[PDB]
């Protein structure tokens, strides 16, 4: 805290070049900028943010802070009128949550089919020709590809190919009635995933650096990954290049777009602080030149900055493919989303379920879920967190735990309460839902249906 500034930034970004600008904030202002990079940042900073700590300000992609907002996390930001025309239009819509602008965008994200130029003279014009590319190719001890398979980020760009889909772009908004995780195009794609799995293709365990690793070192012809990668790609020089993501079944394989942006802290003792760092220094050609010449940001919001770098070619392919796909929605609700896909994939992927089953939960658990207030909010005052206690008396559950649906209300409560998931409670989903259940057999008795 105090008077000087501390940010959080992801680990794969460039961290030291951010911390790099910060210097000349600090020799400029006399404000040390401290840059840190923890684990799980974006579950951490909801988490730490509540108990007095938590950074003045959060890098993450845009996705993330409809549900920091919502909890009331961030400030609003106030750039000038001037400052919001040197910035594209799209990259501010994707970081206003509820008519406020509530982060400054500071580079737009999009996966792109990385391949060995050295290996692959032509890349795989079709995602179902990888079969027969790491036929051929397997007849030398390399494989086609190996991207992070545990980051449903990397693998929804397949899936949502031949209609797979989060929230519908329903009316003004995205309905968070309407989820398109579990049709025949999301089906479509998982099968192929785990069809490559199963073929031997590619192991179901592979991670960004296992991945990475495999393509550094002319392991394997492509990879699945972002601009941030293309440092290291180029560090232990391995000739690639980067274009337009195979197409499946047809149609354009698409990518969940992400903006990069910089939240602040609610409770950051330096709001104003932040705003001089982040809009004088920070989202300048210059400021942002030295993020970019550490880790790649591919694809800034800044007009002047973008403009004449639009000219590289990994930067047209970067675009091209966010262009196959479409931006990612803010809400709150994406949190469960990517929870949902995430164990979707890592079940129907290592054998764990099928497909068919493993979708079918990942609708679920996207979905909305009945109960929330009979249990989340007031009623909680009745777990203790030091003995993790349960007083089933306490007026605080209205006596909800003693009747009809005592049993079924005691058993979602409690889940809740003891939850540890991300984002809390969404692995008693069943649970809600078998309660809701109950409440429909003596709705004389319930008014939590009055909705
Ligand atoms: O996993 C690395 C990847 O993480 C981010 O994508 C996240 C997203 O921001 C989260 O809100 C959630 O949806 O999980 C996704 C990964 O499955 C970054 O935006 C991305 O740049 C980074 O490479």
Redesign the pocket.
Known sequence: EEGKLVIWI?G?KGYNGLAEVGKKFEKDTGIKVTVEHPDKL?EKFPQVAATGDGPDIIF??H??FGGYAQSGLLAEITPDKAFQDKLYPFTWDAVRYNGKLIAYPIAV?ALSLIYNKDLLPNPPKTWEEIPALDKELKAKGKSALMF?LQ???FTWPLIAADGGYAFKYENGKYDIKDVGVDNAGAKAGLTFLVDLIKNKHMNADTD?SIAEAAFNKGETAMTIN?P?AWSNIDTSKVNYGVTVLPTFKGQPSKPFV?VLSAGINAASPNKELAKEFLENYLLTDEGLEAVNKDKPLGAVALKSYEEELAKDPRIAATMENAQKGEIMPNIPQ?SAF?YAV?TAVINAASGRQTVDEALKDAQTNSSSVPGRGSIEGRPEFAYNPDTGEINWDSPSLGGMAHGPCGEEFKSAFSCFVYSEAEPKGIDCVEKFQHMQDCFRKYPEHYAEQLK
């Open positions: 992801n794969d974006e993450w992609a996705d993330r994200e992070n980051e449903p980020y960004y972002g941030w992400g994406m990517w995430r």
